[PDB]
């Protein structure tokens, strides 16, 4: 009744994103006004 094949391949890309990280050192100011400047 049917002679064709299908050949289900992985022609599609894909991805899994949980790029979870730790540090975040971005920007500590301990001199918000330099604390008497002097």
């Amino acid at each position: 009744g049917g002679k064709h094949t299908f050949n289900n391949e992985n022609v599609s890309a894909r991805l899994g994103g949980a790029s979870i990280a730790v540090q975040a050192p971005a920007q500590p100011p301990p001199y918000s006004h330099h604390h008497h400047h002097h």
Partner: protein, 384 residues
């Protein structure tokens, strides 16, 4: 306890029921119609044994249509004209003949499994009068959730738009998760049991559609109730987050607060959220429109405790000398859940002396144990 005569009535009625249905099935059934004789004899004649499944991106009148699907490529396909042809729509799901493709039937939902897990089938035995520690916190939400299924005239005569969604926070050990399993006993509508952590998945864009499922399935299956617990999992607070995982937590937080109130209305879906620390979380998910009130649980006072242990201890013998009424005198920094332990340890601490019914020594021998663990809250003693 001689409740049995209120028990031997029903199993005999579970038996007479068992008497009826097999009898109702066994030859008092009357099968002769064209359905069992003609209908069901034809479908399996053309419907093969395997019926594949897929979707469809577009349709044409006169039994000509299209399919998409993972294992195979697309197709141009005909219809057999017994599917309620003026039903189906894009995005639907289908029943495809196997040797040749052909749209033959369509399913109702086929939504997802996990949503079909979280629903209730059983019913937890806990109830009101399993707790009696309080009077108001029970009430201040009950009138949101349990009357409108019974007594809604009182909300249309006064004629307003009732509330749909609350939150219940406070210090632990006080019976938050409890108070859900009570109301879910006596609701008459469906129910959903969740944690906010459940609904984040590794892949990029599986949550935000998941949250769009359950706020769909509850809508169609109205009336309905939802219960998120420890939602500070996912909805706590937002920041800019130069990262790639924290944001997929936000998209769920942002799609949720679209469902609860946005462009299109949700229906009759009554949320119940729980949490142990608000001020360290929850920016805008906590406002009216979404949650129209906010309940405060705290560690009990004196007079509540008089009713707490009385129901924990309505079964133990304890008949001698206890004088409960000065057992728990001050605040003592203990919740209703430090009660359940003390009724426990002082139950068996008797038993290890091979005595069953109890005295006070067995109690205070426990109370000294629990309270021992307490951190020195008055480690300061600086404030005379």
């Amino acid at each position: 306890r001689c409740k049995l005569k209120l028990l031997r009535m029903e199993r005999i009625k579970d038996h007479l029921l068992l008497e009826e249905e097999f009898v109702s099935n066994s030859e008092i059934l009357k099968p002769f119609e064209k359905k069992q004789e003609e209908e069901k004899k034809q479908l399996e004649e053309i419907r093969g044994n395997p019926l594949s499944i897929g979707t469809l991106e577009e349709i044409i009148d006169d039994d000509h249509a299209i399919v998409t699907s993972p294992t195979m490529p697309d197709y141009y396909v005909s219809i057999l004209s017994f599917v309620d042809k003026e039903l189906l729509e894009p995005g639907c799901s289908v029943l495809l003949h196997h040797k040749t493709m052909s749209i033959v039937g369509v399913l109702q939902d086929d939504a997802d499994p996990m949503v079909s897990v979280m629903k209730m089938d059983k019913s937890p035995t806990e109830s009101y009068s399993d707790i009696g520690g309080l009077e108001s916190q029970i009430q201040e939400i009950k009138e949101s959730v349990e009357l409108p299924l019974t007594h809604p005239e009182l909300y249309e005569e006064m004629g307003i738009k009732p509330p749909k969604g609350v939150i219940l926070y406070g210090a632990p050990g006080t019976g938050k998760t409890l108070l859900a399993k009570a109301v879910a006993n006596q609701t008459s509508a469906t129910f959903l049991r969740i944690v906010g952590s459940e609904l984040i998945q590794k892949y990029l864009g599986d949550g935000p559609r998941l949250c769009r499922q359950i706020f769909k399935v509850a809508g169609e299956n109205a009336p309905s109730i939802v219960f998120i617990d420890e939602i500070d999992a996912i909805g706590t607070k937002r920041y800019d987050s130069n990262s790639g995982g924290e944001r997929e937590i936000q998209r769920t937080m942002l799609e949720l607060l679209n469902q609860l109130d946005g462009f299109d209305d949700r229906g009759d879906v009554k949320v119940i959220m729980a949490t142990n620390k608000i001020e360290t979380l929850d920016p805008a998910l906590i406002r009216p429109g979404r949650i129209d009130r906010k309940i405060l649980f705290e560690n009990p006072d004196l007079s509540t405790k008089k009713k707490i242990l009385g129901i924990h201890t309505s079964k133990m013998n304890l008949s001698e000398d206890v004088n409960l009424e000065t057992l728990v005198t001050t605040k003592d920094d203990l919740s209703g859940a430090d009660i359940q332990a003390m009724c426990t340890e002082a139950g068996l601490l008797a038993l290890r002396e091979r005595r069953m019914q109890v005295t006070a020594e067995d109690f205070k021998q426990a109370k000294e144990r629990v309270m021992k663990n307490k951190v020195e809250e008055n480690l300061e003693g600086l404030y005379l």
